[PDB]
Amino acid sequence: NLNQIQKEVSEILSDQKSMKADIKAILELLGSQNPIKESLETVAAKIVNDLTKLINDCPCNKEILEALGT
Amino acid sequence: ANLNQIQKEVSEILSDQKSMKADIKAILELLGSQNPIKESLETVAAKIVNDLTKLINDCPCNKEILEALGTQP
Amino acid sequence: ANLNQIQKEVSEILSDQKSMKADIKAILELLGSQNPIKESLETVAAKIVNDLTKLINDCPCNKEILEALGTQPK
Amino acid sequence: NLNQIQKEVSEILSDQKSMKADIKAILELLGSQNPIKESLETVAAKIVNDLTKLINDCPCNKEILEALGTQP
């Protein structure tokens, strides 16, 4: 009865330690992550950037200029 | 009254605790097993540029113009 | 009040317990309802390249070149 | 022995208090952000729109225009 209470109160207490441990880990992990918007905005910048280079590199001009004669 | 009441409540605390523990464990498991968004975003970007590169390097619109200049690609 | 003290405190643990349980569920609910980022990345990847392919294949610039060359586009 | 129970109940109560706060944080942190769907969608929208602005701007035409606006 009182031993029963004691036992169960301990189990609660140790269970409560591990719960706390993991909660911290969760708060840590989430805090570490970079903002979705930020990751997006930068990867989105890299997509346009690269493709812009390719576009401005004008790959399809050589063929035309040959038919014309430049 | 009191200790019997106390003991009953303690037992409900113990079990409630047990499931919360399990649920927390799962949230940790779920977040932890997810590959970083930055890493994911990058591989998919790699596909996007790569595939639009194949297209632009295929010069789709040249074909129309070379035709007007009586020649073929 | 020893039993009283123990009583009042165990009761409070039990209250807090309930609302912690609620909030842990709301967290699980939130993460659970997320699409797998990989999958929803694929969808969006396709639409970007799709929409773009449409425009480039439509060949917007050709009309300018043709008219400069001296030809009517069809 | 009743004291140990009393003592331990309070350590239980106080940890409870601080876990309550941390979960509330985790909820707030997870709440403080739009779905990954919405985010992707607006970004993708900007991606295409800027590349559409680029292409419709016809960067390569100026080169050929001088090649056409020229003589042997």
Per-domain boundaries in chain D: 1-72
> How many C-beta atoms surround the C-beta of residue C15 within 10 A?
10
H or E element that contains D69: none
In this structure, which CATH number among 1.10.3210.10, 3.30.1490.100, 3.40.718.10, 6.10.250.630 belongs to the domain A1-70? 6.10.250.630
Please state how this structure was obtained. Answer: X-ray
Chain D contact partners (≥3 CB pairs within 8 A): A, C
Backbone angles phi, psi at C67, to 5 degrees: -65, -35
Nearest residue to B65 (alpha-carbon basis) of D67, A51, D53: D67
Per residue, what are the HEC states of B1-46? CHHHHHHHHHHHHHHHHHHHHHHHHHHHHHHHCCCCHHHHHHHHHH
- List the one residue out of A65, A2, B58 whose CA is nearest residue C6: A2
CA B9 – CA B20 distance, rounded (Å): 16
Dist. CA C6–CA C26, nearest whole Å: 30
Q: How far is B6 from chain A (nearest CA, A)?
A: 8
Q: Say whether residue A54 is in contact with chain D using an 8 A CB cutoff.
A: no
CATH of domain B1-73: 6.10.250.630
Q: With CA atoms as reference, report the closest residue to C55 among A51, D51, A46, A50.
A: D51
Here the tokens at position C5 are 């003290």
C37: chain D residues, CB-CB within 8 Å: 36
List of chain B residues whose C-beta atoms are within 8 Å of the C-beta of residue A25: 28
In this structure, whether the domain defined by C1-74 belongs to CATH 3.40.50.11540 is answered with no
B70: part of which helix (H) or strand (E)?
Answer: none
Residues on chain D touching C12 (C-beta within 8 angstroms): 13
Of C17, C51, C68, the CB nearest to D68: C68
C49 interfaces chain B, CB cutoff of 8 Å: yes
Rounded to a whole number of angstroms, the distance between the first and last alpha carbons of chain D is 108
CA D43 to chain A, closest CA, distance in angstroms equals 7
CB B30 within 8 A of CB A29: no
Decide if D43 contacts C45 (C-beta within 8 A): no
Cβ-proximal residues to A27 (8 Å cutoff; 6+ apart), any chain: D22, D25, D26, D29
Q: Is A45 on the interface with D (CB under 8 A)?
A: no
Fold of D1-72: 6.10.250
In angstroms, this model's resolution equals: 3.1
| C28 neighbors B23 (Cβ within 8 angstroms) | yes
Three-state SS at B59: coil
Q: What is the DSSP letter of C35?
A: P
Q: Do D44 and C40 touch (CB under 8 A)?
A: no
Distance CA C28, CA D1 (A): 39
